Design a protein around this ligand. Structure first.
Ligand SMILES: *C/C=C1/C(=C/c2[nH]c(/C=C3[NH+]=C(/C=C4\NC(=O)C(C=C)=C4C)C(C)=C\3CCC(=O)O)c(CCC(=O)O)c2C)NC(=O)[C@H]1C
Ligand code: NA
Length: 306
């Protein structure tokens, strides 16, 4: 089983126990957005990221305890409609908020049990991308096209297709990258670099990222969900804080921003679309949704070719 999280007295992770880290419940987020949790019946705001004033204009102390009806009157009824108690876990509510003075905010909401999890962050290609992946006549061509298409759409410095072997080691089997960058084609890596509980999570929650590999995580306050006195499920929150071990791996590779999308075949994790940028980089929200879609399409095409 998982260790308890650090804030419940669990051990800190080392190379002896990579696979025990409860990466889905870090109690913290990345600083490029804000996260609120709210009761899924009353809309009471229960937990607030400590940075929330940066995005929402009000201090966490002020936000906590208010209802979504009071805070987001234009969205609460639509949210009640879209994400009722007992709804399918994969459902999402999305809106664009135009009231911030210096931009627009993307709001993304999902339900986990009795909690709503609200994420706020600033905010023919599709036909062509779909066609390119569906048409590729063999797995090599498919991998080449997928990496090139994801790079073109996203702008990432490096986009790889990373395939797991039967011993859970991985290999870069295709790549698209910025002019002059060193090729990572053919490089192979130990199984511990993507440990077993990460691979399991990635069979369920198909995209994750680290937008700035040097940025400190921002706690949720309070850290435990008051409904349960237990950790808040964040596996489905893009803004979730990344494992420290993995962020250090990335820094030591010269990666400022990382993002991957699962390739799932027969319900197993076949591989990953792995994206790197040398500097920090916040892939825009709409482009994340596009990459998720392309991951699903790639997954089915890989299943077919095999
Ligand atoms: C003892 C623990 C270790 C550790 C843990 C760890 N790693 C991940 C997630 C990823 N690891 C990845 C590995 C690579 N990315 C690359 O570009 C290459 C090679 C060129 C490799 C081998 C990748 C792709 C991920 C997924 C996340 C991402 O795309 O950025 C986790 C889970 C992170 C999280 O979701 O919070 C964990 C716990 N890695 C180790 O090397 C050891 C020290
Ligand atoms: Na979770």
């Amino acid at each position: 089983p998982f260790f308890p999280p650090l804030y419940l007295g669990g051990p800190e992770i080392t190379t002896e126990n990579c696979e025990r880290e409860p990466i889905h419940i870090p109690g913290s987020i990345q600083p490029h957005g804000a996260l609120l949790t709210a009761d899924g019946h009353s809309g009471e705001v229960l937990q607030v990221s400590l940075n929330a004033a940066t995005f929402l204009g009000q201090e966490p102390t002020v936000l906590r305890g208010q209802t979504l009806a009071a805070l987001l009157p234009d969205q609460w009824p639509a949210l009640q409609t879209a994400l009722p108690p007992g709804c399918q876990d994969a459902l999402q509510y999305r809106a664009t908020l135009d009231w911030p003075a210096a931009g627009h905010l993307s709001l993304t909401v999902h339900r986990v049990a009795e909690l709503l999890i609200l994420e706020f962050e600033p905010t023919h290609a599709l036909r062509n991308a779909m066609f390119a992946l569906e048409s590729a006549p063999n797995l090599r061509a498919l991998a080449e096209v997928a990496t090139q298409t994801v790079r073109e759409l996203s702008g990432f410095d490096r986009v790889m297709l990373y395939k797991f072997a039967p011993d859970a080691t991985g290999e870069v089997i295709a790549e698209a990258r910025r002019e002059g960058m060193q090729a990572y084609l053919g490089h192979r890596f130990p199984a511990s670099t993507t440990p077993a509980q990460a691979r399991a999570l990635y069979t369920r929650h198909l995209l994750r990222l680290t937008a700035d590999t040097r940025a400190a995580a921002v706690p949720l306050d309070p850290v435990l969900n008051p409904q349960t006195n237990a950790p808040t499920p964040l596996g489905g929150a893009v803004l979730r804080a990344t494992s420290p071990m993995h962020m250090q791996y990335l820094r030591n590779m010269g990666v400022g921003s990382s993002l991957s999308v699962s390739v799932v075949v027969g319900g197993q994790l076949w591989g990953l679309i792995v994206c790197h940028h040398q500097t920090p980089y916040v892939l825009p929200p709409d482009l994340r949704t596009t990459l998720e879609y392309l991951g699903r399409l790639l997954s089915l095409q890989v299943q077919r070719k095999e």
